[PDB]
Amino acid sequence: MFEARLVQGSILKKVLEALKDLINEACWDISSSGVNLQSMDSSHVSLVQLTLRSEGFDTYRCDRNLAMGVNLTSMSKILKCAGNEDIITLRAEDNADTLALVFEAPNQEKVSDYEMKLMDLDVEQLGIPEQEYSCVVKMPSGEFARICRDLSHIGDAVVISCAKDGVKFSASGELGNGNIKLSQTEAVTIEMNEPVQLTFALRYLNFFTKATPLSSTVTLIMSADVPLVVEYKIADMGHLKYYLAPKI
Amino acid sequence: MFEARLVQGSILKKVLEALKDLINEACWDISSSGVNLQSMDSSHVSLVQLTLRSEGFDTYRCDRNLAMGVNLTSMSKILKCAGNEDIITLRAEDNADTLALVFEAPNQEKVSDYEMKLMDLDVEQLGIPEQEYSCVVKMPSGEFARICRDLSHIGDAVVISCAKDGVKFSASGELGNGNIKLSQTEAVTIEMNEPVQLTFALRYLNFFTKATPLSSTVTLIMSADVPLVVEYKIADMGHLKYYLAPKIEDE
Amino acid sequence: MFEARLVQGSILKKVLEALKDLINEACWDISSSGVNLQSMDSSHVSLVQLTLRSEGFDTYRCDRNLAMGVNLTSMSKILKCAGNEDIITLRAEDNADTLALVFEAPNQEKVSDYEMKLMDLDVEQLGIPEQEYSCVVKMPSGEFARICRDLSHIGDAVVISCAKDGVKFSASGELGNGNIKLSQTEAVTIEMNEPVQLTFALRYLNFFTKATPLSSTVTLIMSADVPLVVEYKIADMGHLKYYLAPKIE
């Protein structure tokens, strides 16, 4: 048996909202420590990793580890049927085949029960090398989303430069060019251990900022020659992290 | 002759909003007791009936019965020109041809006058079978609209099964299946005099829920072998009722 | 060297929003008295004129007159990158080629710098139409926008009839007709020096009401024989005026 009860169900809604634009299907790895999901995006450019610890659920039981193949488009459509204050319960039998989602309204007079067919996917885990923290930028998540949206009107790629005084986002295109300079202060903190200057495709960052509702801050972790990490904390539960390799 | 003054003009706006998605044209029957309208949908699947009693109007005068053929799209375009707090007056001369709508703002500095051409429509007598109240469900109108929208993501048809303790709405499709169970308590009341289980096309129920702004509650009246009634009360005036035949089973 | 600092940058955002539906490219004429723009719209029916006087800017310096050819679509995209409370500075070197727009948040922790390529345009050469103030109506801008939208559901043109006590807006089409009567009082004032009854295309007036955010009042200046003026004041700075001919003449 697998059964997990989450009183703040909107978390799951926001999680699915943050993944379906990027991934069509993926494996949810369920174990006694909680829920882990790792997947390349459907264009095989970026990597996504989700962690939800068992301690963040109001009830959690996992008799046997399972790897559930899920069409995220379908699961997101089902989670649109939950109200933002619903209690959400996931349940799956040993040897999978279907996953049940139960939404209990807080009045207690209405209960919704959805059953989703599970898919047959063979995906193997990619390893994540140890992180080098050359620059770490923590900033309001809405400000980062607006930065990416603004510069994608100028160009298709952003140059992120992190040096002692601050962090700069630059783009260049047919209409001209732009840059946005942030200095350390809705607080902005900058840990610069060695300067970095890297180029990234704005299309993928604009996908990553769909996780903005999960947290009021985002963390950017940059180092030379390794993927940028864009990370959102899922309070008292885990994280959603996106990895993106720099250009050229 | 005909003249009716309605101080809460937004009612008419909401009425037209609730009809234009289902029917294009309809005959407004005007008499001294008030306004009646009945029409099948443009696909002749569902039926709509509207009553606005003369007593719900602040002024009401009708010297001779009229059957006004109205393009509901045009009437809706005109009523979009009224503000939500406008006083709305309808006026028509004996033997019709046009309907006048006057919108008076509450400031009193602005008055709008619209004249709408009427049209010639074929009217087919339709009878309503007396209602059998096998199951009656009263619930918040917003909750019913959300139930219908949620399950139309799962499938195109909803099975409504009504039993002693409660009512269940079920759907099935690709993606899988879902059901939503309501128990008696934003109050939900369930009168089950005999069990009913019927299937209905979610597309038409989704048309019916465009009436949600007229009332905070909706009533579902279900019986075996007779069309479902989905009813919204128009407080202190009348009602909008929608009728939908169940889907026919296979074999 | 041209440099202009505007502490209420949202003015510039609203201006570009009020022009971009109507004009793709136009010349911004910069002089020591300020910023002037005039252009026919992209369909060559209506005329648009913008004035922003130097005194309205908190800083203003113009060493030499410039004619900056600007793609207004590009400029509006850049100005969407400014927040509504940003301080905006425009800057251009002598002999143009690019225009710099600097957006400073008021906390001072964020600064955005955009460089926009200018273009060489062959301007049409236009006079500003003659004025006669036969009738002048001042009214809330939102009410005027609502009148134009509502009647464009009835017909393609509005007949504006002006009398001493009030003004009437009428339209007619295949579904029927409508009129909206305003009397002099969110006040509407009417200076009627000669009676007027004039017809104008609602499609173009509906373009003009995109300037509604710049002002809570709009002024209609009507005459037989010269173009209607629809005017929005840009408070303590200038105006945006739209012109439409009453007749084909």
Author numbering:
A (entry chain C): 1 to 185, 193 to 255
B (entry chain A): 1 to 185, 193 to 258
C (entry chain B): 1 to 185, 193 to 256
Please give me the paper's original passages concerning this structure.
Proliferating cell nuclear antigen (PCNA) is an essential cofactor for DNA replication and repair, recruiting multiple proteins to their sites of action. The proliferating cell nuclear antigen (PCNA) has a central role during DNA replication, acting to recruit enzymes to the DNA replication fork, and to modify enzymatic activity and processivity. PCNA also regulates entry into S-phase via interactions with the cell cycle regulator p21 and the pre-replication complex component Cdt1. These PCNA partners all utilise a similar peptide motif to associate with PCNA, the PCNA-interacting-protein (PIP) box.
We examined the effects of the PCNAS228I mutation that causes PCNA-associated DNA repair disorder (PARD). Diffraction quality crystals in P43212 space group grew after 10 days at 20 °C, set up in a 1:1 protein:precipitant volume ratio with well buffer containing 2 M (NH4)2SO4 and 0.1 M NaOAc pH 4.5. Data up to 2.27 Å was collected on the i03 beamline at the Diamond Light Source, Didcot, UK. The overall structure of PCNA is retained by PCNAS228I, it is a recognisable toroidal trimer, with pseudo-6 fold symmetry and a central hole through which double-stranded DNA will fit. There is no evidence of trimer destabilisation, as the monomer–monomer interface appears unperturbed when compared to published structures of PCNAWT. The structure is of sufficient resolution that the electron density of the isoleucine substitution can be identified. The larger isoleucine side chain has a steric clash with Tyr133 in the standard position, forcing a 90° rotation of the sidechain of Tyr133, which in turn repositions a significant proportion of the IDCL (amino acids Gly127 to Asp120). The S228I change has very little effect on the overall structure and whilst the total rmsd between our S228I structure and wild type structure is 0.6 Å, the local rmsd averaged over the three IDCL regions (residues 120–130) is 1.9 Å. Many of the residues of PCNA that are most affected by the S228I change coincide with those IDCL residues sitting at the interface between PCNA and PIP box containing proteins, such as p21 and Fen1. It thus appears that this dramatic structural reorganisation of the IDCL, resulting from the single amino acid change in the PCNAS228I protein is likely to prevent this binding surface from operating correctly.
